[PDB]
Amino acid sequence: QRMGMVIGIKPEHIDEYKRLHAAVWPAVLARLAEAHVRNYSIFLREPENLLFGYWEYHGTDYAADMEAIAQDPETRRWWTFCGPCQEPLASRQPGEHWAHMEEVFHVD
Amino acid sequence: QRMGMVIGIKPEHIDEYKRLHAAVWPAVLARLAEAHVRNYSIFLREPENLLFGYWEYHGTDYAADMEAIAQDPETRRWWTFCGPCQEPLASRQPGEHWAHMEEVFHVD
Questions:
Q1: Closest partner CB to A105 (pick from B21, B102, B104)
Q2: Which PANTHER family does the record associate with it (chains A, B) (predicted)?
Q3: Cβ contact (<8 Å) for A52 and B52?
Q4: Which of A27, B37, B68, B91 lies in the 20 to 30 Å Cα band around A35?
Q5: List of long-range contacts for B80-88, beta carbons under 8 Å, 24+ apart
Q6: Where are the beta strands (DSSP E) in B10-88?
Q7: Angle between helix A73-82 and helix A14-21 axes, rounded to 10 deg
Q8: What's the Cα-to-Cα distance from B43 to each of A15, A18, A20, A63, B49, rounded to whole Å?
Q9: Are B19 and B82 in contact (CB under 8 A)?
């Protein structure tokens, strides 16, 4: 089960965002493995200033495991550094930070 | 070796684009495997009207295999139907159709 998501990034914080993601806290990565997320990549487009997230989720209850991560106190701390670099899409859904995208094609 | 790429889509052709990619010609899919492209997904964002492509390339000379595909007469026919649905990024590089994105994070 694949997922693609998109969020804006403030251009003055691209280098900071990059620096953070060159060394993600190993427990945050462990919290993500624990929620069955695998093969997770983030890609940057300039000058449109967009981040595109891609990951494969091998779990059973997505909205559960996502709420699990969301109150793990150390992941919560981590997001205090990512967030101010980010610019959630004005067109996103209520409750969304990253905006979910619709898969229209796959081939193994 | 992962790749992420982005292109715009004309919103009046989203349904056509979706219809085409629900049943891609098997020879196009086969020539893509021939060029070592695997786990290839495309995602749609509305209302921003962006397509985000993701694939993993297990080859050894990317720029070669990408012009192998590019004059395979069936794949060229195929692109006669995708292209007109698409809107290449004004900010893209000369010679680009889809625009390359920079990976800034990965975890297995």
A1: B21
A2: L-RHAMNOSE MUTAROTASE (PTHR34389)
A3: yes
A4: B37
A5: B81/B20, B82/B17, B82/B20, B84/B13, B85/B9, B85/B10, B85/B13, B85/B14, B85/B16, B85/B17, B85/B20, B86/B7, B86/B8, B86/B9, B86/B10, B86/B17, B86/B51, B87/B7, B87/B8, B87/B9, B87/B10, B87/B49, B88/B7, B88/B8
A6: 37-45, 50-57, 86-87
A7: 150
A8: 26, 24, 26, 20, 10
A9: no
Half-sphere exposure of A86 (CA within 13 A, CB side): 19
Range of the domain at A29: 1-101
User: Residue A93: inside a domain, yes or no?
Assistant: yes
Q: How far apart are CA A45 and CA A47, in angstroms?
A: 6
> Does residue A68 form part of some domain?
yes
Q: With an 8 Å Cβ cutoff, is A58 touching chain B?
A: no
CB contact under 8 A, A6 and B45: yes
Chains A, B: CB contacts within 8 A come to 99
Contact B38, B82 (CB under 8 A): no
Alpha-carbon gap, residue B77 to A48, rounded angstroms: 30
Q: Is residue A106 part of a domain?
A: no
- Distance of alpha carbon A51 from alpha carbon A7, whole angstroms: 5
Experimental method: X-ray
Kindly state whether A32 is in contact with chain B, defined as any CB-CB distance less than 8 angstroms.
Answer: yes
Residue B108 included in any domain: no
Residues in a beta bridge with A79: none
Q: Which two tokens stand for residue B64?
A: 């070669």
Number of domains in chain A: 1
